[PDB]
Amino acid sequence: GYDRHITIFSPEGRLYQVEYAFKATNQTNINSLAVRGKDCTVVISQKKVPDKLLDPTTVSYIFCISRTIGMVVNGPIPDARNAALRAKAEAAEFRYKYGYDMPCDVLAKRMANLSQIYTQRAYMRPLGVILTFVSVDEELGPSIYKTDPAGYYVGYKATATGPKQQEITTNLENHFKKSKIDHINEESWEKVVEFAITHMIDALGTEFSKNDLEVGVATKDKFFTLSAENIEERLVAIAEQ
Amino acid sequence: FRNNYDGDTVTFSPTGRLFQVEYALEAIKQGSVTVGLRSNTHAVLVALKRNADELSSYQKKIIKCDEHMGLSLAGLAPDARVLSNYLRQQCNYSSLVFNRKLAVERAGHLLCDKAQKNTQSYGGRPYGVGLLIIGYDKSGAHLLEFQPSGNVTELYGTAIGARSQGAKTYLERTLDTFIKIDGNPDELIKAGVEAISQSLRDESLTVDNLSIAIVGKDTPFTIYDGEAVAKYI
C-alpha cells in the first residue's frame, strides 16, 4: 500500500513505518544487557564468533562514544554506524560550545529530536537502530537511557534487549525486590560485573565463553573494554553449574 | 517492462539489470557503422558519412576534438555533443596547468565517471552514445571504446554500429598483419577501407561518403576526404 509508504501521517495516525523499524531491530538477534551497579555501569553484549574469514574480536556492538559514555547498538550494522557519527560528533561540539563535558541525559534528548526530523524528511528512511547510552554521569552517577528507533526514549534502572529480552527482565525485576534497592549489590566494581555475567547466563540458559561476550565497564572518567581474559576470571566459578 | 521497476534508473529489477541500458546499446546498432583499428604508431578511423537525400551534403560524423584528438559517434546525437565539448575542456586544463597533453587513458577514467553520475542521480540522462576516441600521447597511439555503460577498453581494433559482423571478422583475420605494420601510414589506411567494405551491404564505396581520420606518432589529427581517400579507395 501507498498508505504504508507515506512518511506523512497514516490514516491510522500511527505510522506503519514506525512499527517497521521495530521489526528491524531484532534481525541481528543480539541479546544485550545493561545494569546499574552502585558506582559502576556494566554493559554486556553477545560477541558473535563467525568463520575464520572474519576476525571475531573486531566484530563488536559496544562502542566508546566519548569519555564515560559508551553505546550498545541493537539492530543492523550499517545503520548503527550512521547513527554513531552524530552522537560522537555532538559530544565534541557541546564541549566546544559550553566548555564542559556533556551529560548523558542531554545527548539522548538531542538524538530523539533528530529521529523525529527523519520522518519529516521525505527522502530519508528512519534509522532502525536502538541506542542505549550507559555512563557514570557527572551528577547522577550510574545512568541508563534507552532510545527507540521511533524516537521514544526512556531511562532505566536495568534493561535487556532482544527477542529473548523477556526472560532476562524477569530475573532482574525479582532480584531488585529482594534486594529492596535499584542498584546491583557490592560497591566493588569487579563482582558486579560477575553478578551481571551470571544473570545473563541464567535467563538465556546458555553458558557463554569469553569468546561469546564482550564486557564494557564504566568507571569515573573512562569507558573502556576489558580484556578477553578478564572475562574468564569471572566466568570460571560460574561455569561449573 | 514499461514503467514500474526498471522504469527509472534508481529502481532495481530483482535481479538488478537495467533494461534501459540494453536500449541505449540499441541506439548504437541503429547508429552509423564505423571501424577503428591501430598499430603501435597510428590509429585509423573510418566512418561512413550519412545523408538524407542527394541534395543533403554527406554529413561528417567524425569530429576533430583537438589537434592530437578526435572522436566518432554512433548513437544519439544530443548526448555526443555534451560529452564532446567536455573532452575538449579537460584536455585544455592539463596543457595549461600541468604542461602535458591529456593522456588518452586518463581522460577515459573521468569520462566513465561522468556517465555513472547520471545513473546515481534522480533524473538526468545516462549518456546513450558510444564513442571511438583516437589519440597520440607520450604512450603513443591509442584507440578506446566508450560504452553507454561508461567502460573504457583499450582494444587493437573494434567496430560499432550497423552490420558489425563483416568488419569484425575481417579484423580478427588481419589482426596480426596491421599490428606488425608500422612506419607505413598509407597501408594502415588501406587496411581500414578494406575493413569497412565487409560491414556494408555495398551501400557506397564513393570517395564522397568515406571519411578517414588518422592520428599517430606521425600524422597529427587530420581529416582526409575526396582525393586523399581516393588513393586508398
Binding site: T25, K52, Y123, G128 | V10, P14, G150, G157
Partner: protein
C-alpha cells in the same frame, strides 16, 4: 511490492528491496580474493580475456590508491571505478589536514558514511559493489572488505564474486598452517592456485592472473604490482598441482 517501486521506504522486511538486489550483482563480478599474510597483504583477481583484440595488462583491474593502499573491486565496473576515485579525494583531504597517511580503518569509516547516505535517500541510487581493500599503514597490515550494505569488518581472508566457494575452502588451509598468515613470497604462489582452481568455474572465457602486494618485508610497505618473472612462475605452481 511498492517498496521496490519507491526507494528508501522502510519495508516490513527492515531492509529496502532495492538495496537487496544491489548485493546480488556483486556475484556477477569476477572471482576476486584477498589474503592476509603476516607482514602484508596480497590481492589477486581473475581477469577474463574477452578476445584476442583485448590488450594484456592495460585495463588492469587492480588500481592504486594513496601510496600504500591496494584496491580491487567486484560488480558494476562503472560504479566501482567512481567509488575508487571518490576514495582518493577523501584520502586527500585527510593527508592535507592531519599531515599523515590514512589509517586503513579510517579509510573504511569514511567510505562507510558515503555509502550509507546514498541508500537512506530516494534520490541517490544504492551502490552495488563489494570492494576488497587494504595494505600496510602505520598500524601495519590489515585486510578489510566493504559490503555495499555498508558493513565492514576486519578479515583474515576475503573472497567474493561467483567462485568464492572454491576460494574460501582453499583459504581455510592458510589459517591452520599458520595463525600468523603464510610468508608473503610463498602466499604469491598459493594465491595463483586459488584463482586458477576458481577459473575452473569461469573457464568459459580465457583469463589472465594479476596479483599485487603491499608488504613491509618485500615492498618496503609501499604498493606494487607483482610482474615479470614472479608472476610467470606463479602460474606454473598452480598448473603443476591441478594436473
Amino acid at each position: 511490492t511498492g517498496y521496490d517501486l519507491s526507494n528508501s521506504v522502510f519495508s516490513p522486511d527492515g531492509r529496502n528491496f532495492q538495496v537487496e538486489y544491489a548485493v546480488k550483482a556483486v556475484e556477477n563480478g569476477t572471482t576476486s580474493i584477498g589474503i592476509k599474510c603476516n607482514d602484508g597483504v596480497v590481492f589477486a583477481v581473475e581477469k577474463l580475456i574477452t578476445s584476442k583484440l583485448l590488450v594484456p595488462q592495460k585495463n588492469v583491474k587492480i588500481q592504486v590508491v594513496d601510496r600504500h593502499i591496494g584496491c580491487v573491486y567486484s560488480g558494476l565496473i562503472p560504479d566501482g571505478r567512481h567509488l575508487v576515485n571518490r576514495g582518493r579525494e577523501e584520502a586527500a583531504s585527510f593527508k592535507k589536514l592531519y599531515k599523515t597517511p590514512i589509517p586503513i580503518p579510517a579509510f573504511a569509516d569514511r567510505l562507510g558514511q558515503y555509502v550509507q547516505a546514498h541508500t537512506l535517500y530516494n534520490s541517490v541510487r544504492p551502490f552495488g559493489v563489494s570492494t576488497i581493500f587494504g595494505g600496510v599503514d602505520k598500524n601495519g597490515a590489515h585486510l578489510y572488505m566493504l559490503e555495499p550494505s555498508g558493513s565492514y569488518w576486519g578479515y583474515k581472508g576475503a573472497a567474493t564474486g561467483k567462485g568464492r566457494q572454491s576460494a574460501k575452502a582453499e583459504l581455510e588451509k592458510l589459517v591452520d598452517h599458520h595463525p600468523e598468515g603464510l610468508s608473503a613470497r610463498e602466499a604469491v604462489k598459493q594465491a595463483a592456485k586459488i584463482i586458477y582452481l576458481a577459473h575452473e568455474d569461469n573457464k568459459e572465457k580465457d583469463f589472465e592472473l594479476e596479483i599485487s602486494w603491499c608488504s613491509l618485508s618485500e615492498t618496503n610497505g609501499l604498493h606494487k604490482f607483482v610482474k615479470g618473472d614472479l608472476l610467470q612462475e606463479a602460474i606454473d605452481f598452480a598448473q603443476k598441482e591441478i594436473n
